[PDB]
C-alpha cells in the first residue's frame, strides 16, 4: 500500500474519453470549436467520460471578443458535460430576412477560411444593415425555435458587435450605445453596448481591429423557444449546439496517453494493479483502487 506516483492522464479502459471537443480540428482550441470559428467545424464525437483541462477556456483567432462581459468562456466545459454534442446542420434563423430590415452578413479578415481571407463564426451572423436602412432602430424582437431532436438540449450562441463613434455611424446609422436582451429557460439577461475605449485585443486573429464583439449563449430545453431583443450590431444565431446524455467530467490534463483502469484527479492515469492506495483522497473516475489512511 503505497502512494501512487503522479503520472499523465490516460484513456479510461472501458470508456470513450474526451480530451478536446474536436480531435482533428488542430489549430483550434475548444472555445474555437464551441464558437464555430472557421477551420474548427469538425466532428465532435460522443464520450461518456470527459476531462476538464481548461478552467478558463481561451480563443485563438477570429474577431476579438470581450470575454468577461458574459459567461462565454465556460461554453466548452458545459458542452463537455453531455455525452453527445453537435453543431446543428441547418441555420436556426434566416439572418438576412430577420426583423430590422434587410441585412448583409458581415465578415472579417481576422477570420480566414480556406476559400476566403475573410469570414465569420458559424454560430453567428453579423447582421449589417444595407446602405439605405442604416439608422437607429427601436428594439427588434426575434424568436429562436428549438430545432434540435430527441431530448436534446439546445445551446444558442449570439452576440453583438460594437465600434468607436465614427465606425458605428458607417456600419449602422447610430453612434449611441445599443441595447440587447436574451431570455430562455426562465433566464433573462440584459446588455448595453459600449462605444470606443475598448480593452486590448487578446486571443484573437491578430489583425488590428477597431471594434469588439460580445458573445453569449442561452440554454433552450427540449421543445422550448428562446428570445433575443436587439438593436444595431446584433450577431444572430445560426448554427446552434445540440446536446444530450451525460458525461462524467474530471479535472485533468492532456494529452491522454495510453489506457488506465482509473482516472485520479491528483495521480492521473491509474491501473488497478494493487487493490489499495494511500495519499490524497481526490476525485476519481472508473475502476479504482480503494483509498486508505497511510
Amino acid at each position, epitope marked *: 500500500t503505497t*502512494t501512487p506516483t503522479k503520472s*499523465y492522464f490516460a484513456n479510461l479502459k472501458g470508456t470513450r474519453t474526451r480530451g478536446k471537443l474536436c480531435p482533428d480540428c488542430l489549430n483550434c482550441t475548444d472555445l474555437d470549436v464551441a464558437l464555430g470559428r472557421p477551420m474548427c467545424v469538425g466532428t465532435t464525437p460522443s464520450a461518456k467520460a470527459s476531462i476538464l483541462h481548461e478552467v478558463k477556456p481561451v480563443t485563438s483567432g477570429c474577431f476579438p471578443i470581450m470575454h468577461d462581459r458574459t459567461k462565454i468562456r465556460q461554453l466548452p466545459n458545459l458542452l463537455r458535460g453531455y455525452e453527445n454534442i453537435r453543431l446543428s446542420t441547418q441555420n436556426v434563423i434566416d439572418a438576412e430576412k430577420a426583423p430590422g430590415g434587410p441585412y448583409r452578413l458581415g465578415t472579417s479578415g481576422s477570420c480566414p477560411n480556406a476559400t476566403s481571407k475573410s469570414g465569420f463564426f458559424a454560430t453567428m451572423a453579423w447582421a449589417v444593415p444595407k446602405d439605405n436602412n442604416k439608422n437607429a432602430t427601436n428594439p427588434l424582437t426575434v424568436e429562436v425555435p428549438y430545432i434540435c431532436t430527441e431530448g436534446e438540449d439546445q445551446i444558442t450562441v449570439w452576440g453583438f458587435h460594437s465600434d468607436d463613434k465614427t465606425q458605428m455611424k458607417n456600419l449602422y446609422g447610430d453612434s449611441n450605445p445599443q441595447k440587447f436582451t436574451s431570455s430562455a429557460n426562465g433566464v433573462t439577461t440584459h446588455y448595453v453596448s459600449q462605444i470606443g475605449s475598448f480593452p486590448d485585443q487578446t486571443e484573437d486573429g491578430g489583425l488590428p481591429q477597431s471594434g469588439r464583439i460580445v458573445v453569449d449563449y442561452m440554454m433552450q430545453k427540449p421543445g422550448k423557444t428562446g428570445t433575443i431583443v436587439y438593436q444595431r450590431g446584433v450577431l444572430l444565431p445560426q448554427k446552434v449546439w445540440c446536446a444530450s446524455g451525460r458525461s462524467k467530467v474530471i479535472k485533468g490534463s492532456l494529452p491522454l496517453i495510453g489506457e488506465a483502469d482509473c482516472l485520479h484527479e491528483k495521480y492521473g492515469g491509474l491501473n488497478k494493479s494493487k487493490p489499495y492506495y494511500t495519499g490524497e483522497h481526490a476525485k476519481a473516475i472508473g475502476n479504482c483502487p480503494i483509498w486508505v489512511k497511510t
Partner: antibody
Amino acid sequence: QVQLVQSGAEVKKPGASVRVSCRASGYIFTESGITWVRQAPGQGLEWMGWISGYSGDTKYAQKLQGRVTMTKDTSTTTAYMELRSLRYDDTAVYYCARDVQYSGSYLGAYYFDYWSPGTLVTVSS
Amino acid sequence: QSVLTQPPSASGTPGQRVTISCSGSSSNIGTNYVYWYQQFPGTAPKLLIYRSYQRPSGVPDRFSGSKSGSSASLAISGLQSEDEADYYCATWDDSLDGWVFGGGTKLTVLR
C-alpha cells in the same frame, strides 16, 4: 524528424532584455508544449518555464516570475522566451525543449523530450 | 545547493558497472517520476531514462534506472569510452512548483 531551431547568439548590456526564438518541426505543435532550460557556463541546468502550444498557458519558475515572458505563434509554430532586466547571472546557454504536456495544470506529471542545440546569451558591459 | 544531490564524480574502468546516485526529498523524488539526461561537452542534453525506469529508443540496456523512497540512481554497466559525459537527474518538485535538476555527475572511465 522532430526539430527545434533557435535564434542566433546574442550579446547585451546589463539591464536590457533578450527575446530568444524557437521554431518547431516534425510534430503537431498544437498538441505539445515548450519548456526552456538555461545553463550558466560550466554549471548545472535551471528550469525556466513552460508554455502550451495549444492554449498559450504558461508556468514560470518562481525565481523568474516578473522577469520572464513566454509566448508562442501557432502560424509559424514558433515559441519565444523574453528575459528582462539582464544581469551577469543571466549569461547562459538557453535551450528550448519539446514538452509532452499541452493542457491541464502544469504539474510535472509529463516530461520534456528533445532539446534544441542551444542559444548563448552573453550579458556584458 | 542543488535540490537534488548528485556526486560530482563517478568512475570505473572500462567494462565495469558504475552507479550514480541522486538524493532528494518527499516533495520531489519521493512523489514524482525521475528523469535522466546525458550531456557531452558543448551539446544539448539528451533524454536517457524517463519515468524512473524507461529507456528511449536508441538508449542501450546498458543504462538502467532505479528508485527507492526519496532517492533515485542511474546504473551504467559494461562501461565504455563513449559514456564519458555529464549525467543529470530531474524530477518535479511540488514544494517549489517547478522542475528541479541535480548538480550533475561527471562520469570518467579511467584509463
